[PDB]
């Protein structure tokens, strides 16, 4: 789930780069297994071992290794640790700075008439944010039957 393979409308799909990175490392591991049961020459198997070390090393992170081994996208594949660090990563952005339910935005204007301890509200926004409250009151009053 954390590396999903969501279906996009129109037959396409969307995955995360973790998916193909896992796929490439599994491919190199299967290849080295096949090599080991062949007892092929140690040059080829040593290149396989080197390649798998490369694959895992670019899996856990993209920076220490020389070239972030990109894909058909002309962008670098985005590996594991990049989903924790950085501005975009979970920590700095999504784990403190996150969206909120029961919150709305608008343009501000003045309306100098009203006292400091209060602010005007649009009626539509007010009826949106406090939707569940109004459901609860309409059920407390019996002005409706059920939540639907």
């Amino acid at each position: 789930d954390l590396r999903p393979l969501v279906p996009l409308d129109g037959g396409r799909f969307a995955t995360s780069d973790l998916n193909d990175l896992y796929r490439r490392v599994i491919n190199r591991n299967n290849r080295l297994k096949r090599l080991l049961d062949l007892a092929a020459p140690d040059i080829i198997v040593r290149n396989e071992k080197r390649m798998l070390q490369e694959a895992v090393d670019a899996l856990l992170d993209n920076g220490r290794r020389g070239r972030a081994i990109t894909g058909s996208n002309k962008r670098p594949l985005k590996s594991l640790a990049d989903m924790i660090k950085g501005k975009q990563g979970r920590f700095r952005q999504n784990l403190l700075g996150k969206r909120v339910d029961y919150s709305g935005r608008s343009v501000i204007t003045v309306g100098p008439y009203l006292r400091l301890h209060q602010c005007g509200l649009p009626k539509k926004m007010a009826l949106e944010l406090f939707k569940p409250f109004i459901y609860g009151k309409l059920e407390l009053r019996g002005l409706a039957t059920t939540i639907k």
């Binding site: 290149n47 080197r50 390649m51 490369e54 020389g66 070239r67």
Partner: peptide, 29 residues
């Protein structure tokens, strides 16, 4: 990360020692 802030136009002695020891593209290798 001496730290030096290099650009294009325990590390200081650590990186100094690793910069005191003198390619890994597996295609070049």
């Amino acid at each position: 990360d001496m730290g030096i802030q290099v650009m294009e136009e325990d590390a200081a002695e650590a990186a100094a020692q690793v910069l005191s020891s003198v390619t890994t593209d597996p295609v070049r290798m």
